[PDB]
Each structure stands twice: as structure tokens, then as C-alpha cells.
Design an enzyme around this catalytic site. Structure first.
Site, mmCIF file in Angstrom:
data_model
loop_
_atom_site.group_PDB
_atom_site.id
_atom_site.type_symbol
_atom_site.label_atom_id
_atom_site.label_comp_id
_atom_site.label_asym_id
_atom_site.label_seq_id
_atom_site.Cartn_x
_atom_site.Cartn_y
_atom_site.Cartn_z
ATOM 1 N N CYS B 111 0.817 -1.215 0.000
ATOM 2 C CA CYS B 111 0.000 0.000 0.000
ATOM 3 C C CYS B 111 0.859 1.277 0.000
ATOM 4 C CB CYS B 111 -0.978 -0.024 1.179
ATOM 5 S SG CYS B 111 -0.207 -0.083 2.835
ATOM 6 N N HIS B 146 -2.852 0.920 7.146
ATOM 7 C CA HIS B 146 -3.074 0.892 5.710
ATOM 8 C C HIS B 146 -3.147 2.323 5.210
ATOM 9 C CE1 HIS B 146 -4.472 -0.045 1.764
ATOM 10 N NE2 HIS B 146 -5.731 0.279 1.991
ATOM 11 N N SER B 163 -4.259 -3.008 -2.155
ATOM 12 C CA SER B 163 -4.664 -3.711 -0.958
ATOM 13 C C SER B 163 -5.080 -5.111 -1.389
ATOM 14 C CB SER B 163 -5.815 -2.951 -0.258
ATOM 15 O OG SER B 163 -6.420 -3.689 0.787
#
EC number: 3.4.17.17
Lengths: 35, 254
Positions: B111, B146, B163
Site C-alpha cells: 500500500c 493501511h 490492498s
């Protein structure tokens, strides 16, 4: 170039490893969306 | 786990060996799996996808999708070993170098690498504002971090990213507000039973690929699990307003 050859073998090994590991994760995700 | 390649390319024996060790432990078929790749007489060579180029025939959404499609083809990296060291407090200049190298080596990304590649690949549509959106989530006893690249263009919000999950990365340019975009990720996390703990929004990333400024990653930090939704909205809209019509000094400065 040695280094170019190595980098092509490492790339093919990475994408071969990657598809294996993506397949593992998607089974364990799917099997978790079960239980 | 937490293995990151700090040797560049070709990868060095230590990192390479540490990669294969890790996946031998995680994968049920163990050493049969490793041995079968590493002792292959011959491996099919994965095709290298061209770096997208902006064309006159593309709308902005077409261009974002072309960028997102490039990242999807790079594939999300499940090997345990992140291949490009991102040092996110680097000056944009150095990060833009690592991004071009992602383009040259053409390996899978996670990510944070994806956020940096999105900046690099949009550093040339100045009507496209880019800003990192970071998440800290909780799931079943563990925390998770994330990040995606928020984008804002012509009055709408969307995002680029990568992702494992298809609902936590790219979002089209159809969200009228920052709140609507962030709430969509929150509702996307609900599907996977993740509670959002923290949301951090960065500043706009300058479009100079030669900047010495780092990305500001934590201009606004919201402890969302402890806030009611209306107050999340008020905070996000106030801050989104600011960045649309101000020059906010990087929070990491003062």
C-alpha cells in the site's frame, strides 16, 4: 549482463511465488468468510 | 512479516534467502512449494506492463483508472518481502526516484509503495490534487496500518491504492466530500469486521518531483472509534475546506 539475467530470474521467481501466496491468502480469506 | 529489501536489485543472498524461509513457514506445502520454484529449469517470464502515458483521448477518470490498472497488473505483494524500501519522511525527490525504480523493476507492491507510485504517475496533471489517507484499524486482537492516495479533482474526491481487498484501494471520482470518501472506507472496513481506530489525512503533495519537502502524512488525526459520526463529519469537512482554500503550514513543522 549477468546482473540483468539474475534480475530476470529473480523477477520470474517473485511472480511465481506471488501468485502462489495470493492463492493461499484468497483461500484462507474465503474459508474465513465461511466460518 | 516485516522483511523489507534494503539491498536494491538484484536482491542479495541474505534477503533472498530470508524471503524463501518466511514463505516456507506460511505455506502449507512448505518446501515442496519453494523447491519447485527455485529449482525450475525454466520459468516463464512475466510480461512487463508499459508505464501509462496520458493521452488526449482520456478524461481524468480514464487516466486514474489507467494508473490504477497499472498497479493492479504489478500485483499486490503477498511474498512477505516488500521489494522497494519506502522511507516516507524522505524528500519527495528521493521518493520519486524509488517510484521510477518501481517502474523499471516491475515487481509487486504494497500500500505505501502504491501511494508513492500514484504521486509519481500523477505529478503531471496539476488539476489532480493528491493527499495520503492513512488508516489504523483493529481486528481480532491486532492493529493494522493501511494507506491510500486520496485524490481531489474538479470538485470530487476519489482515491488510488493497493490492498488485498478490492474495496480498500481505488474509489472513483464521485464523492462530493472528503467525509463521504472516508466513510466509504469505514463502511468497506465493516465488511471485513475491522474497526477503524485512527484516520490521518496528509497535506496536498506538491507536484514538483524535485521538491525537497517531505510528504506531510498527519496533518489531521481523528480518533474515530471514540467519536460519534457527526463530529467525524464536522472535523473532516472543516479540514477539507481548509486544504481547498488555504496554504496550511505542515503540521510536522510547528
Amino acid at each position: 549482463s549477468a546482473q540483468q539475467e539474475l534480475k530476470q530470474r529473480q523477477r520470474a521467481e517473485i511472480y511465481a511465488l506471488n501468485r502462489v501466496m495470493t492463492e493461499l491468502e484468497q483461500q484462507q480469506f474465503d474459508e474465513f468468510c465461511k466460518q | 512479516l516485516f522483511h523489507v529489501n534494503k539491498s536494491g536489485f538484484p536482491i542479495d543472498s541474505h534477503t533472498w534467502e530470508r524471503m524463501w524461509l518466511h514463505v516456507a513457514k506460511v505455506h502449507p506445502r512448505g518446501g515442496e512449494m519453494v523447491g519447485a520454484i527455485r529449482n525450475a529449469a525454466f520459468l516463464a517470464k512475466p510480461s512487463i506492463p508499459q508505464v501509462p502515458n496520458y493521452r488526449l483521448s482520456m478524461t481524468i477518470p480514464d487516466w486514474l483508472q489507467a494508473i490504477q490498472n497499472y498497479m493492479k497488473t504489478l500485483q499486490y505483494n503477498h511474498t512477505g518481502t516488500q521489494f522497494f524500501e519506502i522511507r516516507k519522511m524522505r524528500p519527495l525527490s528521493g521518493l520519486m526516484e524509488t517510484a521510477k525504480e518501481m517502474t523499471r523493476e516491475s515487481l509487486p507492491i504494497k500500500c505505501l509503495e502504491a501511494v508513492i507510485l500514484g504521486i509519481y504517475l500523477t505529478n503531471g496533471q496539476p488539476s489532480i490534487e493528491r493527499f495520503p489517507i492513512s488508516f489504523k484499524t483493529y481486528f481480532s486482537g491486532n492493529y493494522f496500518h493501511h494507506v491510500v492516495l486520496g485524490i481531489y479533482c474538479n470538485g470530487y474526491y476519489g482515491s488510488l491504492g493497493m490492498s488485498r481487498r478490492a474495496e480498500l484501494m481505488d474509489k472513483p471520482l464521485t464523492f462530493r466530500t472528503l467525509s463521504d470518501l472516508v466513510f466509504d472506507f469505514e463502511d468497506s472496513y465493516k465488511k471485513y469486521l475491522h474497526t477503524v481506530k485512527k484516520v490521518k489525512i496528509g497535506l496536498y503533495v506538491p507536484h514538483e518531483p524535485h521538491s525537497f519537502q517531505p510528504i506531510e502524512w498527519k496533518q489531521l488525526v481523528l480518533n474515530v472509534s471514540k467519536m460519534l459520526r457527526a463530529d467525524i463529519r464536522k472535523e473532516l469537512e472543516k479540514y477539507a475546506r481548509d486544504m481547498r482554500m488555504k496554504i496550511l503550514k505542515p503540521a510536522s513543522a510547528h
